Design a protein around this ligand. Structure first.
Ligand SMILES: COc1cc(C(=O)O)c(NC(=O)N[C@@H](C)c2ccccc2OC)cc1OCCCC(C)C
Ligand SMILES: [Mg+2]
Lengths: 599, 239, 648
């Protein structure tokens, strides 16, 4: 453990540390680059869009871990859309006050930034403020296709389903104007705006293909840009209107786009090669059930829910570079539409041409916290050098830390020797599996892999209710069946303000994408040599025979009622129930301490 | 409990051939004496002595023995019976939607759900040239939260002031408000209809009492329309 | 060297279409062969024949489809018990005695309700399929068996569509109460039977329905000192009794079919009902002291009979209830082996997957299981292994172990045992097994390894299997040859060549709609020396998902979570192709079924998750037989009522 109190030098430059291990006939030394203390703060406001004058009340979490200097306090700051810093408070993580907005303050996307004292990184949280009213119903826009062919002959439809907030079908009239949006600004198609009779929440708008082709005949200006559809629907009584926008429909000539970026760029000759392709949609969302092939090796697969498809390639042993080519052979498409990409894999270079390899082979998908995944340690080499290896030293790198390290005994004759690794929930969202062995006390042979655990919670939290209709002002009961000792926050948000600005909210997906960008690995597999594995995993290595890894440069690698009886409804908030429950109830046998709350 | 005699007089007939003759000897017949009712037994004299010598030992054991004591001996005497007869305490109606259909890749058919409060399950089995496909089941849970049903008697004599008892039920945990009104007909002389607001407690019931006095003879029609917080439902009854 | 493997299913089915796969190796001049089924014991009457072309473009592999029709077999005085699968070409002429069976097809009888009352109609229809899982179009003769074993009604009906709708069986106004039985039967040529059970119960209605809902449905070591039983009574929907009088009695029972019960005449409690609910307790150990039993070692697999009479205070009514049996269990768990063949491969790791089921079959997770093992090598020298513990996971109830065995193992004696924290080690569930190594002269093995073992295979995707030989003549192997079986019928075959000096290679196989419930994959190779050659084989059992050939789905419009009594709704059926859809709307309160793929998979021949003692045991346990030059089958065609699990 290194104390941060001693680190005082200015952070435009780096600091290193020698690690000096001295003992009986042992002196080793490795020089290691530093970093700052990792700390992930997350900000949860109640709603995503406010009203001028109304108080904004927020909530800051952390992924707190163990130290002793627990006086680092959170600086919370509110910023105008023109970046004028208004407030700055050294809040306490127990009980902090809201922030009253002014009456005549600017309209636009504000920011909240939260950072520790002397920490150089921060977390942003956005919220709009504007003069609005609750829109009283809700529009779901479902397009025909995720994409839009830049040279095709088919019309684009955007179906409109408008329902009330209490779940009844809107009857009215919608206005759909299409348009092609380049990176920041919109260039509409004014001959394409229609009007649909919405009948029982149903009606679609057809964008005729010639009407699109009459506006942009120059296909060179439709390079990698989006197509929107600004739907504006009005009810039959003329009471209110909402405005939706089906954006993100990309203008591309291929429905898919594959990147490798997850597969090791280094293979071993003689062993098979585990190729993880990554087929995404044109925006970046992963594509499911997309059959890829690789015709040079006659292998073909299918992408999973995370858009990956592992293909196993039977390599010729007499090859030191491997040109491969993957092409998504989707079913009902024409041949010219399907994506394709190629790469080359550079063979592993053994320590002196000895031919001693190691192929740690993890082949199991949708790994949850709680499995036992089997991991095979394949060796290959000269049969006298394989005679003298007894153990593998495996180690597990999660969040840039050696989380666990053990050994695995190899009794002789065993080339394939496997292990069950129990996925504890401390391995979310992913980990690395670096393993090695040594022969003759002279040469080490390493291999790593990158394993993608499913990004669930580390614990659990389920809000539970009877799931039926209520009455305005009635008494409700819900159950916070969570892990014990928790600090459950709460808010109840109207659907009219939830779905209106569903962009700045926090989710479990966005939390792990801030921690998955905190590991020091650069690729997702092995390296060129035995040192190239330990560099590309975010490790360092020193021996007594002076085999050291390269120096790490930076931290980021490249008859009516009387009206005296009708109590009028008068309490119309947009968000409420800003509570904080602490689950202190007794855990059940599965470990889920439940609390019934009433309101 | 089981004072002294109940354990001994039942174990004697624990494995008897006439243990059932002893069992219905100890049943309460208040208006017939022990020999007066033993005379109508016709299963031989062996069953008569097992009857009478279990009949006389209960009339003695009902004089100075407790109510709490003898109704524990009614359960101890249960093993003198033949084993538990197959009975069900529910009545499941005749299952509707029992047919086969040829479906050319999409078919719609409409039907009225029956007047019953139960959660149906519709499953479909598709036999075609490729094989068999048991479909994923769907439920049809007809479930009212607040509902009445009336206890309309089967047969009302002409000229009686019938009190039509009915009960509203409220499955919801929060107690709520309701009013029930009755469709007056030209035959029924009942003591435009005012709504008077009663209130059911949560997870409870509440009685509903009307009164009629019929004059015409035949099959009439009375509509009970409970209008709670969740709409108005007419329940059509034939008196 | 010129050898051949001609793979046939283990038992010919009369009326089926059996695929006979012939694969020849070590040839250059293309040729032909005639696979023909001749009679027995004469080879005079030829039932059917085939013609296969073994040429270079086919990679010297072809398959003829043979068929024994029922109209060519002498019935009456006997059934035919054996035939000859005979093959003749210009290079070989062999023949093998093959047993035949008449068990063709399936009959699913589906009554609407499981429990009937008097003066109600038993609706019944039969889903008839043949053994290629298509509408059989044969006549079916239903039989109605009362509790007295009598043929009370035998109705027959012709099939045209696969769904045989029968007339409704009318339960009388006074029936014979008890378990009835419907026995379906093809009228001719086939010994296929289907059986459906229903119950006829007398309808009496109570003043109030008394239920007895106890704590757990089995008693072991924690309810053996205190067992909280809850009694509930209510008139109607929500009308609940206010006060009542409760008398309970208890008795020990052996099993639920022997209806003699030895009552404990000291444990007759007496409590009071307070607005519906009374919680009573039953100290079991001090109460079973008469009819001594003295322990939980005794009372094992015995029952508890709880009788309850609730007497209403107000009206004076007395409704009775009962529980037939709560099993006095010793240990709360039952251990078995999910998808572990009890056969080793020397030098190759052995994966063990045990499953902790509770004593009423639930997948109890979080239950620590400990594995101890013993290597008994060839020289009868027991060597002990390190013990390894693991945790039963809650999703499927399966713990996972892996033993890396030494190179000269012969018999593994491993014993699993639960290591729960709050039970004594005489009330922990334990099991013991024994795995035997695969035997082969000139010791050479095959280990085929399914890649994604944990999740089920999706139709349309691709299976990826990694094949490792462990021969001393590895560089003599030329081809890997495989066979894919589904429902006891060979549906695929092939030959991937061996990559010359790669120590192990991967085979890519497409998974199709032939192999829907599950499938087996038997891979082998041929290592030839100066002696006779030998096939070296291994097989796995696959777990392909349940995706029917034209996906039926039904919906209700409008789809609400509550309907009105009398509301007209529309049922929206939508299939993938033309089909006959059978509909059934059953009141779901009767259940307190239609599982089919766990019965339609019983056409699969051979059991276990693969493996074998020698070469021919791998072929035999996969549901195959064969005839070669290299090895013989020599497999005893006995009964073997095997009980393996294969699935969580
Ligand atoms: C099947 O044998 C019984 C039936 C009944 C039955 O309800 O008919 C019964 N009930 C009963 O004593 N009630 C008590 C409260 C009572 C007490 C005093 C006066 C009248 C009473 O009753 C209205 C007891 C019975 O056996 C007990 C032991 C006899 C055997 C061991 C010889
Ligand atoms: Mg992940």
């Amino acid at each position: 453990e290194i104390p941060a109190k001693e680190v005082s030098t200015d952070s435009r430059q780096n600091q290193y540390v020698v690690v000096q291990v001295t003992g009986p006939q042992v002196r080793l030394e490795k020089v290691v680059l530093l970093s700052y203390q990792s700390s992930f703060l997350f900000i949860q406001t109640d709603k995503g869009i406010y009203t001028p004058g109304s108080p904004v009340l927020y909530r800051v979490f952390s992924m707190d871990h163990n130290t002793s200097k627990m006086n680092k306090t959170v600086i919370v700051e509110f910023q105008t859309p023109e970046g004028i810093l208004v407030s700055s408070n050294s809040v306490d993580l127990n009980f902090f006050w809201p922030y009253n907005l002014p009456d005549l303050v600017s309209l636009g996307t504000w920011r909240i930034v939260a950072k520790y004292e002397h920490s150089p990184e921060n977390y942003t949280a956005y919220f709009d403020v504007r003069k609005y009213v609750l829109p009283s119903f809700e529009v779901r826009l479902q397009p025909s296709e995720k994409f839009f062919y830049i040279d095709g002959n088919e019309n684009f439809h955007v179906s409109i389903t408008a329902r009330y907030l209490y779940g009844e079908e809107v009857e009215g009239v919608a206005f759909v104007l299409f348009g092609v949006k380049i990176d920041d600004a919109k260039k509409s198609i004014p001959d394409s705006l229609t009007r649909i009779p919405i009948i029982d929440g149903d009606g679609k708008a057809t964008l005729k293909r010639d009407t699109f082709r009459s506006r942009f005949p120059n296909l060179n200006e439709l390079v990698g840009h989006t197509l929107y559809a600004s739907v504006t629907v009005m009810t039959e009584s003329g009471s209110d209107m909402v405005v939706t926008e089906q954006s993100g429909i990309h203008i591309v000539a291929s429905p898919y786009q594959i990147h490798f970026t997850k597969t090791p760029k280094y293979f071993k000759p003689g062993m098979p090669y585990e190729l993880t392709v990554y087929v995404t949609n044109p925006d970046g969302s992963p594509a499911a059930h997309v059959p890829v092939v690789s015709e040079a090796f006659h292998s073909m697969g299918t992408t999973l829910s995370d858009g990956t498809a592992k293909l196993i390639l039977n390599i010729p042993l007499n090859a030191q570079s491997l040109p491969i080519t993957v092409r998504t052979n989707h079913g009902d498409l024409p041949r010219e539409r399907q994506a394709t990409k190629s790469m080359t894999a550079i063979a592993y270079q053994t320590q002196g041409g000895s031919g001693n390899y190691l192929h740690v082979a993890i082949t199991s998908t949708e790994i949850k916290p709680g499995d036992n995944l089997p991991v095979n340690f394949n060796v290959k080499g000269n049969a006298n050098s394989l005679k003298q290896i007894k153990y593998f030293t495996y180690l597990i790198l999660n969040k840039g830390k050696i989380f666990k390290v053990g050994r695995q005994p190899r009794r002789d004759g065993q080339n394939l020797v496997t292990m069950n690794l129990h996925i504890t929930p401390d391995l979310i969202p992913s980990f690395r599996f670096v393993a090695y062995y040594q022969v003759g006390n002279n040469e080490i042979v390493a291999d790593s892999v990158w394993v993608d655990v499913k990004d669930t919670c580390m614990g659990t939290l389920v809000v539970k209710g009877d799931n039926l209709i209520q009455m305005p002002g009635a008494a409700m009961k819900i159950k916070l069946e969570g892990d014990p000792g928790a600090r459950v926050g709460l808010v109840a948000v109207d659907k009219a303000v939830y779905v209106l600005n569903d962009k700045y909210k926090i989710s479990q997906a966005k939390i792990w994408d801030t921690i998955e960008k905190s590991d020091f690995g650069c690729t997702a597999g092995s390296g060129q040599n035995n040192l190239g594995v330990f560099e590309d995993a975010g490790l360092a290595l020193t021996t007594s025979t002076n085999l050291n890894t390269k120096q790490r440069s930076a931290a980021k690698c490249p008859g009516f009622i009387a009206d005296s009886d009708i109590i009028s409804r008068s309490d119309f908030p947009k968000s409420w129930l800003w509570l904080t429950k602490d689950l202190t109830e007794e855990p059940n046998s599965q470990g889920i301490s439940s609390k019934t709350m009433s309101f | 409990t089981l004072q002294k005699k109940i354990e001994e007089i039942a174990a004697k007939y624990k494995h008897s051939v006439v243990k059932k003759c002893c069992y219905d000897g100890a049943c309460v017949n208040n208006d017939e004496t022990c020999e007066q009712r033993a005379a109508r037994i016709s299963l031989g004299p062996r069953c008569i002595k097992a009857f009478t010598e279990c009949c006389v030992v209960a009339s003695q054991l009902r004089a100075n023995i407790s109510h709490k004591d003898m109704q524990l001996g009614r359960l101890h005497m249960k093993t003198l019976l033949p084993v538990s007869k197959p009975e069900i305490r529910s009545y499941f109606p005749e299952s509707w939607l029992w047919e086969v259909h040829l479906v050319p890749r999409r078919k719609q058919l409409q039907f009225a759900l029956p007047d019953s409060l139960t959660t149906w399950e519709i499953q479909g089995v598709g036999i075609s040239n490729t094989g068999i496909c048991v479909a994923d089941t769907v439920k049809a849970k007809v479930f009212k939260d607040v509902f009445l049903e009336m206890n309309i008697p089967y047969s009302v004599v002409r000229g009686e002031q019938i009190q039509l008892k009915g009960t509203v039920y409220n499955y919801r945990t929060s107690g709520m408000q309701f009013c029930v009104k009755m469709s007056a007909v030209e035959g029924i002389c009942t003591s435009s209809s005012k709504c008077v607001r009663q209130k059911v407690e949560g997870s409870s019931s509440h009685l509903v009492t009307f009164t009629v006095l019929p004059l015409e003879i035949g099959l009439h029609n009375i509509n009970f329309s409970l209008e709670t917080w969740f709409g108005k439902e007419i329940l059509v009854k034939t008196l | 060297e010129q050898t051949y493997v001609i793979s046939a299913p283990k038992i010919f089915r009369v009326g089926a279409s059996e695929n006979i796969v012939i694969q020849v190796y070590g040839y250059t001049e293309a040729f032909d062969a005639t696979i023909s089924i001749k009679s027995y014991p004469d080879k005079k009457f030829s039932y059917s024949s085939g013609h296969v072309h073994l040429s270079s473009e086919n990679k010297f592999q072809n398959s003829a489809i043979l068929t024994i029709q029922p109209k060519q077999l002498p019935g009456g005085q006997n059934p035919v018990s054996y035939v000859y699968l005979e093959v003749v070409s210009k290079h070989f002429s062999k023949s093998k005695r093959m047993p035949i069976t008449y068990d063709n097809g399936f009959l699913f009888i589906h009554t609407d309700k499981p429990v009937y009352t008097p003066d109600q109609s038993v609706k019944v229809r039969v889903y008839s399929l043949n053994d290629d899982l298509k509408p059989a179009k044969r006549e079916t003769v239903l039989t109605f068996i009362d509790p007295e074993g009598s043929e009370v009604d035998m109705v027959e009906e012709i099939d045209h569509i696969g769904i045989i709708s029968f007339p409704d069986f009318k339960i009388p106004s006074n029936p014979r109460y008890g378990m009835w039985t419907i026995k379906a039967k093809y009228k001719e040529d086939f010994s296929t039977t289907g059986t459906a059970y229903f119950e006829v119960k007398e309808y009496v209605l109570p003043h109030f329905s008394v239920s007895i809902e106890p704590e757990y449905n089995f008693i072991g070591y924690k309810n053996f000192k205190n067992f909280e039983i809850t009694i509930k009574a209510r008139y109607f929907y929500n009308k609940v009794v206010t006060e009542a009088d409760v008398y309970i009695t208890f008795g020990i029972r052996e099993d639920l079919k022997d209806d003699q019960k030895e009552m404990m005449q000291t444990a007759m409690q007496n409590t009071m009902l307070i607005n519906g609910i009374a919680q009573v307790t039953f100290d079991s150990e001090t109460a079973v002291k008469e009819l001594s039993y003295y322990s939980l070692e005794d009372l094992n697999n015995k029952y508890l009979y709880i009788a309850v009479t609730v007497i209403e205070s107000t009206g004076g009514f007395s409704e009775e209830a009962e529980i037939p049996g709560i099993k006095y269990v010793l240990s709360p768990y039952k251990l078995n082996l999910v998808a572990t063949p009890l056969f080793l491969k020397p030098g190759i790791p052995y994966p063990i997957k045990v499953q902790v089921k509770d004593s009423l079959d639930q997948l109890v997770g979080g239950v620590p299981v400990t594995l101890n093992a013993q290597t008994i090598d060839v020289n009868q020298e027991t060597s002990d292994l390190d013990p390894s513990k693991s945790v039963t996971r809650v999703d499927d109830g399966v713990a996972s172990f892996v033993l890396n065995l030494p190179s000269g193992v012969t018999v593994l004696e491993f014993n699993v045992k639960t290591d729960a924290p709050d039970l004594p080690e005489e009330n922990q569930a334990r099991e013991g097994y024994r795995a035997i190594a695969y035997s082969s002269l000139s010791q050479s093995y095959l280990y085929i390894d399914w890649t994604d073992n944990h999740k089920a295979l999706l139709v349309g995707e691709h299976l990826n299997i990694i094949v490792t030989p462990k021969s001393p003549y590895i560089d003599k192997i030329t081809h890997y040859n495989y066979l894919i079986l589904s429902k006891g019928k060979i549906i695929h075959f092939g030959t991937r060549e061996k990559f010359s000096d790669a120590s192990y290679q991967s085979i890519n196989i497409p998974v199709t709609q032939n192999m829907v419930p599950s499938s087996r994959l038997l891979v082998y190779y041929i290592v030839t020396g100066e002696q006779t050659a030998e096939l070296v084989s291994d097989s796995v059992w696959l777990n392909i998902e349940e995706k029917c050939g034209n996906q039926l789905q039904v919906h209700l419009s409008p789809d609400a979570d509550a309907y009105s009594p009398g509301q007209t709704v529309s049922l929206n059926m939508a299939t993938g192709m033309d089909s006959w859809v059978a509909l059934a709307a059953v009141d779901s309160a009767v259940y307190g079924l239609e599982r089919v793929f766990q019965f339609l998979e019983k056409s699969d021949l051979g059991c276990g998750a693969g493996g074998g003692l020698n070469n021919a045991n791998v072929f035999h346990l996969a549901g195959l037989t064969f005839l070669t030059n290299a090895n013989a089958d020599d497999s005893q065609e006995n009964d073997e009522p095997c009980k393996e699990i294969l699935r969580p």
